[PDB]
Symmetry: C4
Subunit: 82 residues, 4 copies
């Protein structure tokens, strides 16, 4: 995949994760963006996590769609900076 | 490995993780499925974690069997969507 | 690397992590073995974590030596089971 | 990339992460170095995490710049020890 296409794909993931956590779990937009990165990078501090069943379902969907996408995006960013 | 075989393998992992956490640590089926994904993806929020020795042993077995399986499944899903 | 050599290397990592957490942070052998796997797999629940400076130093040493070793061992175990 | 260049790159990441967490979130230098490794290795215990908006932004920047760099450094260290 061209590197710019990978960029758009992870941006789409980040939008999905952020808006979903905001609306489902009710955290601010900023906290939700932070949580989305912490989740798809697999860091997982746990300072924020879903506490509702819908949130848990949604979080599984973000884990499945987002972790591989982020990993490829990181791998590509590595090339254009090193 | 054919992609559909990898799908079945991770589904088997998800069943093992979920039923085990449910019966050993006593959390609901839904929470247990959520915990299983959060564990084999290596996110690890810690909102749920085993608190019994059997649970800790079981969790090590899920980590060894499940993290590589999930990683391959993600890598394959990437191909059939990008 | 031959797969059996990788097995011995991760076992050595697991012994190092477990005895170190036990003696430095004072948790039981079982909890310490559990923490060692949760750490080198990068799950990181945080139900257990070092609270002393020596423990924090030691944990960095386990992260550097152990995460790559575990990742290779998982990758190999995948081959001999799939 | 030559292995010594990768070493310098991850050291630069570690300096960036440590000084940033120290000054933005106010934790000691030692705790901040520990947190930086726990973050870029994707362990993410959550015993320490940013609680300010600037800290959350900064942490996203460390996740994007640091996780791939650490992963390559681990992969290389593996070669020069096995
Ligand atoms: K983690
Ligand atoms: K974690
Ligand atoms: K990899
Ligand atoms: K992780
Ligand atoms: K955690």
């Amino acid at each position: 995949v061209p590197a710019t296409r990978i960029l758009l794909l992870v941006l789409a993931v980040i939008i999905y994760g952020t808006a979903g956590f905001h609306f489902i779990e009710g955290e601010s937009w900023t906290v939700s963006l932070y949580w989305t990165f912490v989740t798809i990078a697999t860091v997982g501090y746990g300072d924020y996590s879903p506490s509702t069943p819908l949130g848990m379902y949604f979080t599984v969907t973000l884990i499945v769609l987002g972790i591989g996408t982020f990993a490829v995006a990181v791998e590509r960013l590595l090339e254009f900076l090193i």
